[PDB]
């Protein structure tokens, strides 16, 4: 088993297609347990001002009761037999997933055509969801990751539906009511935007029987979204009260196509990553990491890639604090550059094994597996191959490196967004200065 | 006029390069006045919004 081999030993995710449009996929394994949930293409992405936040509304509404199981009974069935129930709702993408045992997936399943098909909507539970969803978005207020990355989408892409956040504004969560709630599940969850994954010890051929015989009476066989615009652009929410300041500086990626993706993310990974409770610290191949560990500038920095369907923010975000912002501002835009002008041949290697390390430990666990799942056939449309990727990231060497990201960092108008005592925060001016380079 | 010629040998040459500095000025200041508000367009389009809790 010489990795390769091992590659190509990974079974494959087996893909059909309802008459109603559901793409009914499946990856078999020898696990006792499974992950079984719906993706749909819903989200904030397709969500107007006006309905702006009604995604996460029904994704709250849809666990607390259905039509044909009133209230805790549903959640009575998922713990009575050690099933967890689980959400989420991105800006393009929703998903309900319930981990269950292998033997479980009769029911499973039936559960979710309750959640996504008979839902109650109930306008007591709305009353109740309401307040509840007021209090969680004045937690995430506090959130100040969560909030500089919101924005950071809003400054990137103003006056576009990409800029909403998931949650929408509060005057939206207030104003909303239970019509609007059944206007937007009746208008986006269909059946040709949903893809009923299922990963672990499930048999495709017992999947698409049960899809059959519970997800058969969806929609028959309308937002298909509007190709937003990136304007770069900088927030500035300085508050000096806070500890640290967080900072997010990014430019238009490509999407979930465009092959420029895993080059793309080698770059990335050559940047790295690095917080304060890191191992070797000033050791690491890193000069970015290395230099932040050497003058503790920071206390956490990522490289984010962001990727929307048809475009995408590529860049970094970190924390440090007020003192220091200006000075890794400078060394960001430094091995941004460097990356840009002179990859050397090395540190493609390294981010290939990275990047390589990245994919192959991320699909551990049938969770990730069944995420995998949902996602590709929703932005990719097919289950890409653990071969295919490793055959990609082959094909990245360090001339492709400095040509993508010339074409994607070299003399781009970033957008930022900054939160904390960000004075030190460099003028939007230096910051696009920065952004090229004389010398080159 | 040819004692004023004596007076400024350099009044012809004078008024040449009169000439071409009024034309070099008139493309030049036009152009570094583009470059000024091209840089400080930043600043002149502030949006800054008070948000008190
Ligand atoms: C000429 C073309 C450029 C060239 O040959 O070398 C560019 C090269 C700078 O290359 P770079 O990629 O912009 O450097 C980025 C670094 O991060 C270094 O810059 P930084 O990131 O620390 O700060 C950004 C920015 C900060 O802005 C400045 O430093 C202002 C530069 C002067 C502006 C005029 C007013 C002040 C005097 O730096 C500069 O603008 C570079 C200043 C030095 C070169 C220009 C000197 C002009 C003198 C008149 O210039 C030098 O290294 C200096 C010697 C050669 C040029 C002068 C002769
Ligand atoms: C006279 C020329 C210098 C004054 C006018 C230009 C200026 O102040 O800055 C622009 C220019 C280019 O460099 P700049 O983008 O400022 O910084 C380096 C890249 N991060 O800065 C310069 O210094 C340009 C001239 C030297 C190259
Ligand atoms: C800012 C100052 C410089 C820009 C203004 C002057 C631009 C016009 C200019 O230079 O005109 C050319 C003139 C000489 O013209 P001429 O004798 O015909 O020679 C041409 C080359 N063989 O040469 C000149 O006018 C030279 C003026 C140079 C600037 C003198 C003041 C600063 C020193």
Redesign the pocket.
């Known amino acids: 088993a010489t990795y390769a081999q091992a590659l190509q030993s990974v079974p494959e995710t087996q893909v059909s297609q309802l008459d109603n449009g559901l793409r009914v996929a499946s990856e078999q394994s020898s696990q006792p347990t499974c992950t079984v949930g719906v993706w749909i293409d819903a989200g904030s992405r397709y969500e107007n001002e006006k309905n702006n936040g009604a995604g996460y509304f029904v994704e709250h509404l849809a666990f607390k009761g259905t039509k044909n199981r009133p209230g805790s009974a549903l959640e009575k069935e998922v713990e009575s037999m050690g099933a967890h129930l689980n959400a989420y709702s991105t800006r393009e993408h929703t998903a309900y997933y319930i981990k269950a045992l292998s033997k479980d997936l009769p029911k499973a399943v039936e559960l979710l055509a309750d959640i996504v098909q008979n839902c109650s909507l109930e306008d007591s539970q709305i009353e109740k969801e309401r307040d509840v969803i007021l209090q969680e978005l004045q937690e995430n207020d506090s959130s100040m990751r969560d909030v500089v990355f919101d924005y950071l989408h809003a400054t990137a892409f103003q006056g576009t539906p990409l800029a909403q956040s998931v949650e929408g504004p509060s005057e939206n969560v207030r104003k909303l009511s239970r019509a609007d709630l059944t206007e937007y599940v009746s208008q986006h969850y269909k059946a040709p935007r949903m893809v009923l994954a299922a990963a672990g010890g499930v048999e495709h051929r017992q999947l698409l029987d049960l899809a059959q015989k519970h997800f058969s009476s969806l929609s028959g066989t309308v937002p298909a979204f509007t190709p937003c615009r990136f304007t770069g652009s900088e927030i500035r929410h300085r508050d000096d009260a806070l500890p640290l300041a967080h900072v997010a500086i990014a430019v238009e990626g490509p999407g979930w196509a465009n092959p420029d993706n895993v080059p793309l993310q080698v770059a990335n990974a050559i940047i790295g990553h690095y917080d304060s409770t890191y191992g070797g610290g000033t050791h690491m191949s890193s000069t970015l990491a290395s230099v932040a560990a050497t003058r503790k500038l920071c206390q956490s920095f990522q490289t984010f890639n962001i990727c929307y369907a048809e475009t995408g923010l590529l860049g970094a975000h970190f924390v440090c604090d007020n003192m220091s912002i200006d000075d890794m501002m ?1 060394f960001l835009q ?1 091995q941004w550059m460097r990356l840009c002008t002179s990859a050397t041949e090395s540190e493609v290697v390294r981010g290939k094994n990275i990047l390589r390390n990245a994919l192959v430990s991320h699909l551990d666990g049938t969770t990730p597996v069944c995420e995998d799942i949902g996602r590709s056939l929703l932005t990719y449309g097919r289950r890409i191959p653990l071969a295919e990727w490793e055959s990609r990231i082959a094909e990245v060497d360090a001339s492709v490196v400095r040509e993508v990201c010339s074409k994607y960092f070299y003399d781009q108008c970033p957008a930022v967004a900054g939160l904390g005592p960000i004075e030190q925060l460099p003028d939007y001016n ?1 910051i696009r ?2 952004m090229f ?4 | 006029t040819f004692l004023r010629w004596a007076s400024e040998p350099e009044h012809d040459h004078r008024k040449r390069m009169g000439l071409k500095m009024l034309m070099m000025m008139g493309l030049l200041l036009p152009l570094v006045y583009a470059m000024k508000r091209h840089k400080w367009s930043v600043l002149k389009s502030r949006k800054l919004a008070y948000r008190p809790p």
């Not at chain 1, 380079?437 to 080159?440: A, G, H, K, M, V």
Request: aromatic share 34%.
């Open positions: 400078f430094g230096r200065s920065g380079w004389l010398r080159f």
